[PDB]
Amino acid sequence: IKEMPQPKTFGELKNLPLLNTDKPVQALMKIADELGEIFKFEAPGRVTRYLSSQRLIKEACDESRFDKNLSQALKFVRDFAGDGLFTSWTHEKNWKKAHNILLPSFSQQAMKGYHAMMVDIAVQLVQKWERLNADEHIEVPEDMTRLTLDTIGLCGFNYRFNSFYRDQPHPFITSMVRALDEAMNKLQRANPDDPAYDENKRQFQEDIKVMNDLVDKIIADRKASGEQSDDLLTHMLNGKDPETGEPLDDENIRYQIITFLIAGHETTSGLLSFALYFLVKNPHVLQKAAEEAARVLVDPVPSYKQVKQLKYVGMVLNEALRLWPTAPAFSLYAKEDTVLGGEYPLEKGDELMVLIPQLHRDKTIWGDDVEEFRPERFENPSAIPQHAFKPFGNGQRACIGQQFALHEATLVLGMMLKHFDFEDHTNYELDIKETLTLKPEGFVVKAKSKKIPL
Numbered sequence: 147i148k149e150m151p152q153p154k155t156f157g158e159l160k161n162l163p164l165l166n167t168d169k170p171v172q173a174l175m176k177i178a179d180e181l182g183e184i185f186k187f188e189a190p191g192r193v194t195r196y197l198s199s200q201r202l203i204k205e206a207c208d209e210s211r212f213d214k215n216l217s218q219a220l221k222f223v224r225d226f227a228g229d230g231l232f233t234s235w236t237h238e239k240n241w242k243k244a245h246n247i248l249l250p251s252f253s254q255q256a257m258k259g260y261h262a263m264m265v266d267i268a269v270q271l272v273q274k275w276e277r278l279n280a281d282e283h284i285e286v287p288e289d290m291t292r293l294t295l296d297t298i299g300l301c302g303f304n305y306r307f308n309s310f311y312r313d314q315p316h317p318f319i320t321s322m323v324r325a326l327d328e329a330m331n332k333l334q335r336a337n338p339d340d341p342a343y344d345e346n347k348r349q350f351q352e353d354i355k356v357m358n359d360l361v362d363k364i365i366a367d368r369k370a371s372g373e374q375s376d377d378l379l380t381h382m383l384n385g386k387d388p389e390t391g392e393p394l395d396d397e398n399i400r401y402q403i404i405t406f407l408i409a410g411h412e413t414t415s416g417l418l419s420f421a422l423y424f425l426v427k428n429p430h431v432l433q434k435a436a437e438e439a440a441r442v443l444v445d446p447v448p449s450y451k452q453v454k455q456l457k458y459v460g461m462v463l464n465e466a467l468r469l470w471p472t473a474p475a476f477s478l479y480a481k482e483d484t485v486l487g488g489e490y491p492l493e494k495g496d497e498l499m500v501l502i503p504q505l506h507r508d509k510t511i512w513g514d515d516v517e518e519f520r521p522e523r524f525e526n527p528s529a530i531p532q533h534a535f536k537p538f539g540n541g542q543r544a545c546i547g548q549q550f551a552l553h554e555a556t557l558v559l560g561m562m563l564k565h566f567d568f569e570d571h572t573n574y575e576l577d578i579k580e581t582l583t584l585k586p587e588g589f590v591v592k593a594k595s596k597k598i599p600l
């Protein structure tokens with residue numbers, strides 16, 4: 147039985163000022179490097195413990211001992227994502243009900259049905275880059291966010307955000323980004339009741355109203371038309387939970403749609419941005435991935451079966467998730483009193499934070515070369531120990547979108563590598579912006595077309 151280290155304190159504010167930064171996850175990673183596999187973090191009226199080792203995280207991932215906790219970040223996102231799957235407690239009736247209804251819609255089998263809509267948006271990205279002039283560059287996270295938002299809009303509810311037709315986002319996206327900004331900024335406030343934050347609170351309420359108005363209108367418009375599409379909204383209007391026998395109500399459907407739009411906008415775009423970053427920084431890997439794309443993607447329109455053949459492209463994506471898991475943390479609470487790792491006694495209700503980027507840097511699992519980008523680490527999936535690699539979270543509360551995200555990212559990265567050579571023309575220095583998620587900021591490249599027709 148051991149005492150936990152704790153980072154530097156600020157009198158009454160305890161550790162809270164350590165999060166007063168635009169890069170709090172990166173700050174916590176530096177604290178984990180200093181203090182090790184576990185540290186205590188205190189704020190006024192709150193304590194959590196940050197876990198960084200596979201040894202402790204494998205126990206945290208025991209669903210008999212720990213369940214998903216809503217972090218303060220998730221509690222603030224709940225103000226607009228409600229009791230959708232991502233911001234509901236496991237014990238809320240709408241969690242298991244929506245999980246049972248939506249699981250089949252997110253299965254590997256279901257991806258065959260979404261493939262044609264993913265190809266539609268992927269072809270728009272390829273055509274955009276084909277149409278750049280010689281002197282021009284690509285804004286990578288910007289274009290990946292246009293793609294992933296558009297894909298989830300079309301597959302989610304047959305709505306075209308038409309992000310490749312715009313400089314300035316769709317108004318829904320303005321409100322959603324500003325709501326996510328307010329949710330994440332609110333975490334840091336030592337003094338959240340200050341009238342200085344009054345304008346923030348007024349804007350947040352207007353942004354929630356905007357998101358609810360468009361999505362409630364989409365649902366009402368679909369129920370009125372009676373149209374049956376191959377989208378998640380059709381599945382949610384028609385679907386019945388086998389357990390309760392009930393369908394989702396229109397309010398919960400709206401929360402699920404908001405939740406899916408947050409995920410598509412924030413997570414898959416980060417993965418694709420980091421993958422391209424690592425490829426241009428590691429030309430041997432880029433060539434190996436480009437050979438696979440050229441050999442496999444023999445038709446102008448990729449098929450579902452061809453995307454499944456892109457093994458090395460999948461390894462590239464997994465190695466990007468290893469180093470920069472774009473959803474960088476998840477939270478757990480102890481279901482009962484328990485002892486973590488034979489050393490750290492916890493009481494029922496005690497909270498843990500899993501620091502996924504630090505888990506993915508555990509040298510006892512990955513070896514001394516943990517900072518190196520080597521997709522070959524993933525050539526044999528069975529060689530990865532259980533709970534060593536958790537970019538999609540854990541257990542029944544793991545990412546429902548995992549198959550969707552990886553199908554989209556594999557298709558898109560495959561097509562990018564088939565159609566273009568890439569140049570890191572600025573020798574870009576990685577700068578990671580933190581929103582809900584991690585993304586390269588300012589990452590630019592030049593494409594050179596291989597002049598392969600669509």
Ligand code: HEM
Pocket residue numbers: 214231232233245298405406409410413414417471472473475476477536537538539540542543544545546547548550551
């Ligand atoms: C690379 C892309 C993505 C990553 C890295 C990612 C990561 C995660 C992680 C780590 C969790 C667990 C959160 C927690 O325990 O608090 C999660 C949950 C979830 N993700 Fe994703 N996600 C991705 C893409 C998507 C997409 C595309 C969708 C939907 C269109 C999605 C929908 C969800 C939902 C609904 C949950 C909550 C599941 C539940 O608890 O029932 N994600 N994701």
Ligand SMILES: CCCCCCCN1CCC[C@H]1C(=O)N[C@@H](Cc1ccccc1)C(=O)O
Pocket residue numbers: 165170171187188189192193194216217218219220333472473474475476499582583
């Ligand atoms: C899909 C990705 C979601 C990532 C969400 C987590 C993202 N946080 C954003 C900042 C870092 C990270 C985190 O550790 N937050 C804790 C922070 C916290 C701990 C103790 C007291 C006050 C606040 C929290 O929100 O509770």
